[PDB]
Amino acid sequence: QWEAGMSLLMALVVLLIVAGNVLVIAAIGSTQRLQTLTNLFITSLACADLVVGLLVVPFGATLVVRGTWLWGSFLCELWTSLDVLCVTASIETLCVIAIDRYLAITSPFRYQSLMTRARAKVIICTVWAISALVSFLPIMMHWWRDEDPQALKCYQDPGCCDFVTNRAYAIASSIISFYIPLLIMIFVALRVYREAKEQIRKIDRASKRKRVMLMREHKALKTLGIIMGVFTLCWLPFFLVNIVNVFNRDLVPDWLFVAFNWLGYANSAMNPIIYCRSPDFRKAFK
Numbered sequence: 677q678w679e680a681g682m683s684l685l686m687a688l689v690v691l692l693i694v695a696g697n698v699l700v701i702a703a704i705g706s707t708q709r710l711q712t713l714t715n716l717f718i719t720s721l722a723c724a725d726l727v728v729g730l731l732v733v734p735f736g737a738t739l740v741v742r743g744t745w746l747w748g749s750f751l752c753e754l755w756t757s758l759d760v761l762c763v764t765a766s767i768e769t770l771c772v773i774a775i776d777r778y779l780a781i782t783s784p785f786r787y788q789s790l791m792t793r794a795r796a797k798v799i800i801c802t803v804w805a806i807s808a809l810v811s812f813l814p815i816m817m818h819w820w821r822d823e824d825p826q827a828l829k830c831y832q833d834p835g836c837c838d839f840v841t842n843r844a845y846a847i848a849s850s851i852i853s854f855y856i857p858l859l860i861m862i863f864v865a866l867r868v869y870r871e872a873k874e875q876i877r878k879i880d881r882a883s884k885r886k887r888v889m890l891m892r893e894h895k896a897l898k899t900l901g902i903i904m905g906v907f908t909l910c911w912l913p914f915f916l917v918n919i920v921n922v923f924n925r926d927l928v929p930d931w932l933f934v935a936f937n938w939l940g941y942a943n944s945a946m947n948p949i950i951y952c953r954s955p956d957f958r959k960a961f962k
């Protein structure tokens with residue numbers, strides 16, 4: 677009866693995630709003063725992580741507690757699809773946030789003429805569409821199924837819900853859902869750092885016009901940098917673990933694999949906690 681304490685702790689992290697993220701989606705839902713562009717992208721993100729803490733983590737918690745899948749073959753397949761989708765969405769939205777920042781620094785003039793709230797919403801949508809095109813369909817067309825015996829044994833078993841995939845899909849899937857979006861997000865976040873240096877060097881050389889709209893686009897950068905940093909700190913561990921497994925399945929422990937996965941799962945709780953930093957959000961949290 678170690679199952680009772682486990683159910684406890686997991687219901688706690690479920691609390692942190694669901695409460696935090698609904699708080700974010702409802703705060704930006706109320707204060708129009710808060711409905712900035714970057715805040716709307718943070719909404720996309722909060723909806724992904726909400727889904728994680730609402731389904732991905734509860735159902736994934738039964739499986740860890742009970743050693744087996746108690747919801748049958750189809751719900752297994754689907755639940756996996758939703759985990760995958762949530763991560764793909766998170767990382768594509770972070771990528772987009774970095775790009776948005778770079779533009780809203782390098783071409784401030786052009787930026788306010790073109791980018792609006794409605795264009796932000798179209799963008800978030802298209803992101804979720806790509807996310808679901810790239811993640812959701814490969815699973816449902818079975819492109820992920822492995823030839824090996826024990827694999828099929830798991831497909832045949834409704835209590836077997838382990839993501840056992842062929843190696844071409846391990847590679848192409850992890851590149852497309854994760855490594856591409858990551859790389860673009862990092863290179864762009866760095867080009868953004870260097871712009872926000874040369875700018876804060878030459879703050880002297882700016883009309884109280886540019887020095888004030890960029891004074892507003894600039895603050896809330898440190899937060900975004902923290903968000904991105906931390907995300908990388910969970911999901912890169914998991915995905916590297918995942919790519920080594922293709923070279924040699926005996927090189928990674930099965931519980932390390934489960935650990936680094938629950939690392940990235942916990943990331944969906946960290947984001948709300950990282951918002952307690954900003955006085956704009958901190959006051960809105962009380």
Ligand SMILES: CC(C)(C)NC[C@H](O)COc1cccc2c1CC(C#N)=N2
Nearest residue numbers: 756759760763839841845846849850853
């Ligand atoms: C318990 C499970 C395993 C269901 N959780 C999935 C994991 O959190 C995220 O896994 C992935 C996300 C995006 C792209 C991926 C991926 C695994 C592979 C492979 N080959 N390509």
